[PDB]
Structure formats: C-alpha cells, structure tokens
Write a protein that binds this ligand. Structure first.
Ligand code: ATP
Ligand code: CL
Ligand code: MN
Ligand code: MN
Length: 436
C-alpha cells in the first residue's frame, strides 16, 4: 500500500490499486497520464479518466490530443469529472481501469468515487491508479518543487485592511491568495481592488467560468478558495496562504454548521504552496503562510456525506462499496445506514442535482418522504433556523403567492454562507431555478 513515483505497465492488472505521488509540477497530469493511457489502449482495457474539474478535463483533452479519448459531459477512453462519474453511478459502464487525477480531492463526490473504485479493485474487477502529490495521511506541508520556493511565515490579513501589510500590495508579480471562504474572499478581493489591483475571484460555483480569465496577462491577484488545490495551473510568482479553511460539521446529527476558520491539513497546505515553484528555470517564487496545519478530525461532514452517496449506489446484488481504506476511519457511520428506498432515492438525487442542495440536507429532506417540488420544509422550521441577510430575516415570494420567512426545517449553514449560496437557496425555496 505504499505510493510509487513511476508508472510501470504491471500496474494495469486487475486487483492493483496504485497511488502515484510525484511532487507538484512533476508532470503527473501532462506527461505520466498520456503514457498510462497509451498503455491502456495497447492492452485493450476499458478505461475511464476522472478529472477534478471540467477545466482540468480540458487540460487533458489537450495533453491527450490524437488519442481516442471521449469527453463526457454527463476502442475509446472515457473522460469525465469526479462529480460526473458519481452522478452517473447514482442513476438507474464496467471499466476495468480507473485513472483518478488529483485523487486528494475531499469533496463528497470525489470521496465516494474513490470508495466505489477501490471496492471494484478489491472485488478483482478492475485496476486503478490514484494520482496525487498528497495522498491521505500526508504530513509534509513543504514537498519538492521544480524550482526552490522561498517559504516565509507572516501575518496574513484575514479581513480588509486600511494600512499596514505594504508587502501585499508592493509586489509587482502575480499572486494567488487562498482564503477560507467565499465571503472572506469577497472582502479581501474588494480591499485589493480598492488598492488598484486587478483581481480574479475563484470558488466552486464560479470556477469553470472565471478560471479562463487567469490564462491572460492582465491580472495581479487570484483570490480563491480551496478549489484551486485541485490541479489549477497558474503562472504566478507568489502564493499567500491564510492556512485556514471552513469545516462543515454535523452537530449531533441535527444540523450542519461551518466551523472555523481553522487550520488546513498538511495536504491542503502542500497543494496551495504547490501552485508556485513550478518553472524549473524560474527561481525566486515565494510562499507566504499565516499559521500551522492540523489534521482533519472524525467530524468533517464530507466523509459522512460520501457514505450517504455510497449507500445509494448499486454495486453487485446487495453489496455496498466501502470508503477507500485510508479514509474509512474518518466516519463512524455503519455501511448501509443511509440506504433509501426507490422513490426517496430519486428525490435525494434530484435535490442535489436540480436543487443544488448539500448532500446532508438533500438526505434529510428525501428521507423525510418529502417530494422534490414540495418546498414547505423551507419555511416551517424552528425560529432558531431563521435565515438572515443584511441582519433582516430573509423572505421569499413562493409560487403560491405567499411571502414567507426563510426558516428551514433542517439547518445546513452551507445554504446561506454567502450571497451566491443564499440567492440560490431563496430561488429553490420559491420554486424557481436559475437557468444553468
Ligand atoms: N516552461 C514550462 N513548460 C511546461 N510546463 C511548465 C513550464 N514551466 C512551469 N511548468 C509547470 O509544470 C507543471 C507540471 O505539469 P503537471 O500539471 O503535469 O504537474 P502535476 O504533477 O500534474 O502537478 P500537481 O501535483 O500540482 O497537480 C505544469 O502544470 C506547469 O504549470
Ligand atoms: Cl468554494
Ligand atoms: Mn522533480
Ligand atoms: Mn496534476
């Protein structure tokens, strides 16, 4: 179960799961992946490539051009995102080779995908290669890089500033700044823009659209959440790292809060720092970081949400997939305890795909026997669940013509953590849906 740093053809045999852990910038995505795919084609395997984002799935369509690779938005090598793969498993192919790039991605759909894949491997039905510089259990925040990095611990602004921090804005290059949340990024970006900087903001909801702006000369800062840890390539000379994240936590099975901001894992710190130092002929890149790392605890909601997904994915007769073993200890939930019957399972999937709700919240609503289009639960919760914005209680016109206070029966802090999330949830609660 030890990671390797070189691909060999014998890794493609069934029952092998290999972790390829070359350091950041070493060429996993653009040079090792095409070598694996060529070998999979020559041995006539049924192969799927899993990219963390549609952006990366484009960086692969280019590093694989000329090969029979077919990108799938929802012989021939299949290419899709982690989320697309898990979404397809939740719907009513039998690959024998799974290649997952950026296999450190900790979103529930990626965790679930690794659990399903590693289970197929242990069943003797497939081989798999997990590519990541930071596999689970990474404890080194400062891995190798193509060019040496200047690491400096410094106080990193956590809110807008009106003076001081001259080192932030006196820089003449391009900076990638990792923030713990969209709302914190909004405040940092506005402060930078007031200083005359050209700022690009990245988050999960906006990444596929806004990342293209970074491919141009005309920007000074990218202000990004942890989504840029997943193989986002920048031409930057500096990373500023809060070393902070938010952690969704299920409190007593009752609600989801956003805990923190609190220290990132070593893997996240290494991936953030790994955005620079990538040009072997360009010394002098800087990594300015604001605190220490800490390891995830038993209570990060994403691993329990991954079990909610896997309990509802068909495997083989009555079997359910386990989590990938190095992550299976992050969850106390019993295999199968979140399995839904057929009609509630359809609602569960619809609330996630069409409703844009977090997994945990979708599960609560679906397992209560609520159908997808019935939005009464958004308004009948405890007054403690009242959603606020601008310190006034949030209100919504329902399609029935009633103006109701947003007061969901189950409280998931992710539906109201920033303006974009709240806008989406208000439209959901009103029975509307933005065109996407
Ligand atoms: N002159 C250059 N030509 C090509 N690549 C370069 C050059 N200078 C720097 N690089 C960087 O080296 C990186 C190595 O490519 P690749 O994405 O395959 O590495 P990786 O192992 O996938 O990294 P990560 O662990 O961060 O996902 C490129 O993404 C690119 O950003
Ligand atoms: Cl985000
Ligand atoms: Mn190297
Ligand atoms: Mn990569």
């Amino acid at each position: 179960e030890t990671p390797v740093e070189c691909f060999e053809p014998s890794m493609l045999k069934k029952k092998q799961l290999t972790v390829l852990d070359l350091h950041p910038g070493a060429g996993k995505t653009r040079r090792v992946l095409p070598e694996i795919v060529r070998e999979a084609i020559k041995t006539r395997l049924r192969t799927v490539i899993l990219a963390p984002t549609r952006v990366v799935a484009a960086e692969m369509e280019e590093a694989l051009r000329g090969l029979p690779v077919r990108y799938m938005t929802t012989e021939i090598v299949d290419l899709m995102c982690h989320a697309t793969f898990t979404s397809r498993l939740l719907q009513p192919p039998n690959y024998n080779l799974y290649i997952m790039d950026e296999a450190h991605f900790t979103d529930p759909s990626s965790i679930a995908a690794r659990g399903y894949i590693s289970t197929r491997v242990e069943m003797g039905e497939a081989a798999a290669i997990f590519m990541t510089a930071t596999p689970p259990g990474t404890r080194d925040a400062f891995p190798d890089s193509n060019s040496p990095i200047m690491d400096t611990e410094v106080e990193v602004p956590e809110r807008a500033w009106s003076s001081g921090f001259d080192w932030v804005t006196d820089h003449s290059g391009k900076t990638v700044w990792f923030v713990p949340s969209v709302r914190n990024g909004n405040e940092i970006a506005a402060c930078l823009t007031k200083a005359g900087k050209r700022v690009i903001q990245l988050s999960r909801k906006t990444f596929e659209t806004e990342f293209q702006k970074t491919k141009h000369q005309e920007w000074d800062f990218v202000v990004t959440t942890d989504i840029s840890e997943m193989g986002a390539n920048f031409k930057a000379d500096r990373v500023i790292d809060s070393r902070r994240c938010l952690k969704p936590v299920i409190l007593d099975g009752e609600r989801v809060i956003l805990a923190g901001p609190m220290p990132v894992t070593h893997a996240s710190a290494a991936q953030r720092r790994g955005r620079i130092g990538r040009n072997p002929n360009k010394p002098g890149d800087e990594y300015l970081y604001g605190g220490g790392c800490a390891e995830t605890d038993e209570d990060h909601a994403h691993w329990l949400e991954a079990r909610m997904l896997l309990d509802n994915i068909y495997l083989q007769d009555g079997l359910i997939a386990s989590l990938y073993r190095p992550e299976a200890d992050k969850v106390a939930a019993i295999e199968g305890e979140f399995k839904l019957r057929t009609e509630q399972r359809k609602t569960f999937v619809e609330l996630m795909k069409r409703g844009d709700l977090p997994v945990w919240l979708a599960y609560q609503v679906a397992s209560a026997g609520i159908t997808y289009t019935d939005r009464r639960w958004c308004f009948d919760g405890t007054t403690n669940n009242t959603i606020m914005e601008d310190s006034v209680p949030a209100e919504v016109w329902t399609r029935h013509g009633e103006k109701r206070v947003l007061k969901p029966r189950w409280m998931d802090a992710r539906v109201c953590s920033d303006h974009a999330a709240l806008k989406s949830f208000k439209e959901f609660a009103a029975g509307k849906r933005a065109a996407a």
